[PDB]
Design a protein around this ligand. Structure first.
Ligand SMILES: CNC(=O)N1CCN(C(=O)[C@H](Cc2cccc(C(=N)N)c2)NS(=O)(=O)c2cccc(-c3ccc(OC)cc3O)c2)CC1
Ligand SMILES: *[C@@H]1O[C@H](CO)[C@@H](O)[C@H](O)[C@H]1NC(C)=O
Ligand code: NA
Ligand code: NA
Lengths: 11, 28, 250
């Protein structure tokens, strides 16, 4: 149930 | 770090958190 | 954390969340010990009996958090891992002896009101404070009971337990690299770490210089908050020579 983190940190 | 273990929102401004006294009272 | 309470804002600014990229989920606690080094438990990253062996690119560390699930815009900072270091004699085959690991961040994290490193003990601080009956503090986002999950960071203060009592509560071979903490059944008070708190810090506030020191790492327990059982913690000072060697070499 975690809020999505900004895409910056997954690239 | 030379500033390690001093919390900006507590020790740095001389505020105590709600249960740290319990720790101090055990050191006896 | 079982039988704990909501942390105050900024109460544990060294608290680190180990977060898996895909799927996005909590993996473990951890702690900030400098602007680019994070301490956690080895078993958070490596346990071959269960096919667990995370690499750097699988993980992120989230720093300055309070809420468990929310993305705390303008407050938390998310860092990528440059390198993982597991203790070379981490005993995953038997009893998690030397359950410790370091993670070097790709870039230093900016300190703030919510982000600040904990101290590691010197020999004197260890010998002075790591005594039976003295209380330390455990924090984490793990389970609220034997499994449910907290909305925000949880905190509980627990007493260190005499080494023979620790050994007599378990069939596991306890080493000098471990200590245990928690209340006895006749002491009435309760509390324990639990699943999800793994790798997080057990800290004590020095009465001499008023600084917080990380004496332990949440390592394992038999159930959570069971009568006659105790939480076991990695003995940080006993492994500090390995810590210093890693940070100095790398
Ligand atoms: C290695 N992998 C893994 O995932 N971790 C192992 C630790 N761990 C636990 O101890 C959990 C929750 C937990 C975590 C931390 C502190 C406490 C506490 N109460 N203070 C409770 N407790 S448990 O459910 O009883 C259980 C389930 C599965 C395996 C073991 C287990 C225990 C000891 C051991 O060697 C000494 C090896 C083991 O496999 C225990 C879960 C996280
Ligand atoms: C964990 O995985 C890495 C990646 O290949 C490997 O090099 C390492 O030896 C593994 N560790 C263990 C204990 O299996
Ligand atoms: Na025993
Ligand atoms: Na117990």
């Amino acid at each position: 149930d975690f809020e999505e983190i900004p895409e910056e940190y997954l690239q | 770090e030379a500033d390690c273990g001093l919390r900006p929102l507590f020790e740095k401004k001389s505020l105590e958190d709600k249960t740290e006294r319990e720790l101090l009272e055990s050191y006896i | 954390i079982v039988e704990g309470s909501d942390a105050e804002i900024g109460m544990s600014p060294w608290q680190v969340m180990l977060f898996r990229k895909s799927p996005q989920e909590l993996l473990c606690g951890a702690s900030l010990i400098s602007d680019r080094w994070v301490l956690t438990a080895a078993h958070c990253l490596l346990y071959p009996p269960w096919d667990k062996n995370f690499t750097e690119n699988d993980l992120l560390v989230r720093i300055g958090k309070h809420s468990r699930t929310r993305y705390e815009r303008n407050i938390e900072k998310i860092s990528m891992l440059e390198k993982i270091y597991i203790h070379p004699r981490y005993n995953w085959r038997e009893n998690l002896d030397r359950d410790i690991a370091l993670m070097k961040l790709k870039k230093p994290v900016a300190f703030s009101d919510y982000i600040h490193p904990v101290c590691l003990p010197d020999r004197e601080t260890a010998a002075s404070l790591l005594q039976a009956g003295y209380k330390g503090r455990v924090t984490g986002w793990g389970n609220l009971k034997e499994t449910g999950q907290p909305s925000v960071l949880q905190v509980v203060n627990l007493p260190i337990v005499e080494r023979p009592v620790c050994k007599d509560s378990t069939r596991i071979r306890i080493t000098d690299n471990m200590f245990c903490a928690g209340y006895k059944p006749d002491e009435g008070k309760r509390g324990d770490a639990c699943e999800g708190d793994s790798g997080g810090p057990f800290v004590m506030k020095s009465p001499f210089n008023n600084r917080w020191y990380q004496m332990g790492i949440v390592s394992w327990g038999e159930g959570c908050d069971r009568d006659g059982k105790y939480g076991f913690y990695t003995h940080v000072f006993r492994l500090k020579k390995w810590i210093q060697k890693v940070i100095d070499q790398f």
